């Protein structure tokens, strides 16, 4: 009844402490949906895109520790918008296990500093809206301190953005997501 993709920022601007906090966040969300019919998929992005597991992969082995523990940081630039496009066009597709009539949810974890992306958010966000894709944004690092990165989290998040933008250290993201599903 819900298909949840994580899209995690692994650029070199994410320090190692923050990247581990992304893995722990992801893991805690998956553990909490364990007694439910939720399916998960994850992609890491920088200037390249690695699909760590598809919805089909999770179907066959729904172990958060099996899939999330070996994830290693990619480094490189930050192509968040192209990352969003590749999620809606490939990971939310039945070939990768996505169920029609499930609620589509994308959780983008980033420091809010897109760099090196030939796509702007205006090229990918309206398309994600036209697919059924509800977007949550989890900010790490300095994201909430600068006006540009704050704007970036607002631009990604579905609306009202205050029910979709959260910080990685709190449980508020997972509390809102549980309550909405």
């Amino acid at each position, epitope marked *: 009844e819900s298909d949840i993709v994580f899209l995690i920022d692994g650029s070199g601007s994410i320090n190692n402490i923050d990247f581990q906090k992304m893995k722990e966040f992801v893991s805690t969300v998956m553990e909490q949906f364990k007694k439910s019919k939720t399916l998960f998929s994850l992609m890491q992005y920088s200037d390249e895109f690695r699909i760590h597991f598809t919805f089909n992969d999770f179907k066959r082995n729904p172990s958060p520790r099996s899939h999330v523990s070996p994830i290693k940081q990619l480094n490189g630039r930050t192509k968040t918008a192209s990352g969003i496009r590749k999620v809606v066009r490939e990971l939310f597709h039945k070939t990768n296990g996505a169920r029609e009539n499930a609620a589509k949810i994308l959780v983008v974890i980033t420091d809010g500093e897109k760099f090196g992306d030939p796509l702007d958010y205006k090229d990918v966000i309206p398309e994600a809206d036209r697919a059924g894709v509800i977007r949550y944004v989890i900010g790490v690092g300095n994201a909430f301190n600068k006006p540009q990165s*704050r704007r970036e989290l607002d631009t990604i998040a579905s609306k009202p953005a205050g029910e979709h*933008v959260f910080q990685v250290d709190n449980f508020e993201a997972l509390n809102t997501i549980q309550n909405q599903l």
Partner: nanobody, 122 residues
Framework: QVQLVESGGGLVQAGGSLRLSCTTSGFTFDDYAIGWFRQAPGKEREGVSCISSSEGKYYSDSAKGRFTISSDNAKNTVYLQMNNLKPEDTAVYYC????????????????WGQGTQVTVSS
């Protein structure tokens, strides 16, 4: 019950300075980060500043270097000291409160005051 009451607005010349006050009541003060926002008619809204006991202070690009936000925790009041004011800073200034455990530095306030007018003339 919940109140966020701006004062200290009014007319000042360019180069001048004003101190806004946001006196609050009706909620536990320490549970909220408090910020200032502004809007003139015909102009886009802007965040200005925010203060949180856990996340520190935040300033917009226009505010940074000129403006100082502070909190009198005993009186549940937040001040915005605004120096080097300009005619382009003419706007209705609102204070706002956002639940601090979100950790967002006032990005999406839960409560808003009525706003008070600030006019900057040459």
């Amino acid at each position: 019950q919940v109140q966020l009451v701006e004062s200290g607005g009014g007319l000042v010349q360019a180069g001048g300075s004003l101190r806004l006050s946001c006196t609050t009541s009706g909620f536990t003060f320490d549970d909220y980060a408090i910020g200032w926002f502004r809007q003139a008619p015909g102009k886009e809204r802007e965040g200005v500043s925010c203060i949180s006991s856990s996340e520190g202070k935040y300033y917009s690009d226009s505010a940074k270097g000129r403006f100082t936000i502070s909190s009198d925790n005993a009186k549940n009041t937040v001040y915005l000291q605004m120096n080097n004011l300009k005619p382009e800073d003419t706007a209705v200034y609102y204070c706002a409160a956002e639940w601090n455990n979100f950790g967002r530095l006032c990005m999406y306030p839960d409560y808003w005051g009525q706003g008070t007018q600030v006019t900057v003339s040459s």
